[PDB]
Structure 1
Amino acid sequence: AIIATAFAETVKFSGSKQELQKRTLALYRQFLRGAPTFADLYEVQFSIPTIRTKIRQEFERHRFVDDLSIQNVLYAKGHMEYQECINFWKQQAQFLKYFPEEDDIQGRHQPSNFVDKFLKNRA
């Protein structure tokens, strides 16, 4: 038959927000635990704490989503991303998409006020 792969979870839409909260915290634990494996697979310059910080920021972004269906989709996609990272299916190039700040300073001029944005036609 056609069997599932490493760290594959069948898609199940949780009927309750608490039963989803359990699964979500388990996924967060999985990510935090895989951080050192990630740093080894993807030959990263930065530290393991930086990876774990990034993971926290990712999970933080959806801290206030209310609709159960949306949380279900966010969870299923987050698990897909975990499976992609832990199996080394990603290359370094796509993994480093998650760490834009880790790259060096892009230049002297990142405008913040109106006048600087207006001088670069970005007002």
Structure 2
Amino acid sequence: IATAFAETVKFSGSKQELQKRTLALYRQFLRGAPTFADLYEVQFSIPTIRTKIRQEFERHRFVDDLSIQNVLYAKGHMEYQECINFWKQQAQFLKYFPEEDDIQGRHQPSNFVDKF
């Protein structure tokens, strides 16, 4: 009998309509980025948020089936729902951000020789 930020679940049929719907989702998910940086007090900048959001949607550019893209849309809008307020905490929130290199030391240079 309520919402929190108007999460709706109704998957359309046509892939064009799903395209437009994910597009508007991307706009809200991008617009909330200074609200995110306010809310969680990250070290990095707002353009780091924006390039990583763009990275996350380019992870699923070439997914064929609209009947997979439905639940991908639900995951996207739902994690927008859990990010637009303070359900997620910053320790929960840094699981998207492999930010620093110096945690690792010297490591694998993706050569076979240094697997050994």
**Normalised-by-shorter TM-score class:** over 0.9
- Cα distance, 1:103 vs structure 2: 5.8
Q: CA 1:103–1:26 in structure 2 vs 1: closer, same or farther (change >3 Å)?
A: farther
- Distance in 2 between residues matched to 1:102 and 1:24, nearest whole Å: 30
- Cα distance, 1:75 vs structure 2: 0.3
- Cα distance, 1:95 vs structure 2: 0.8
- Distance in 2 between residues matched to 1:102 and 1:21, nearest whole Å: 34
SS at match of 2:64: coil
Range 102-111 or range 3-12, more displaced: 102-111
Corresponding residue pairs, total: 116
- Distance in 2 between residues matched to 1:39 and 1:104, nearest whole Å: 23
- Cα distance, 1:10 vs structure 2: 2.0
The list of structure 1 runs, each at least 4 consecutive aligned residues, that deviate by more than 3 angstroms after superposition, is: 102-105
Q: CA 1:103–1:32 in structure 2 vs 1: closer, same or farther (change >3 Å)?
A: farther
Structure 2: runs of 5 or more not aligned: none
- Cα distance, 1:106 vs structure 2: 1.3
Q: CA 1:13–1:36 in structure 2 vs 1: closer, same or farther (change >3 Å)?
A: same
Q: What is the TM-score normalised by the length of structure 2?
A: 0.93
Range 29-38 or range 103-112, more displaced: 103-112
Larger RCO (CA within 8 A; separation ≥ 6): 2
Structure 1: runs of 5 or more not aligned: 119-123
Q: CA 1:34–1:64 in structure 2 vs 1: closer, same or farther (change >3 Å)?
A: same
Q: What is the TM-score normalised by the length of structure 1?
A: 0.88
Are the aligned partners of 1:46 and 1:102 in contact in 2 as well (CA < 8 Å)?
no
The aligned residue for residue 12 of structure 1 is 10
Are the aligned partners of 1:65 and 1:71 in contact in 2 as well (CA < 8 Å)?
yes
- Distance in 2 between residues matched to 1:91 and 1:32, nearest whole Å: 19
The aligned residue for residue 55 of structure 2 is 57
Q: CA 1:21–1:54 in structure 2 vs 1: closer, same or farther (change >3 Å)?
A: same
SS at match of 1:50: helix
Are the aligned partners of 2:32 and 2:84 in contact in 1 as well (CA < 8 Å)?
yes
- Cα distance, 1:105 vs structure 2: 4.0
- Cα distance, 1:94 vs structure 2: 1.1
Larger Rg: 1 or 2?
Answer: 1
- Distance in 2 between residues matched to 1:39 and 1:103, nearest whole Å: 21
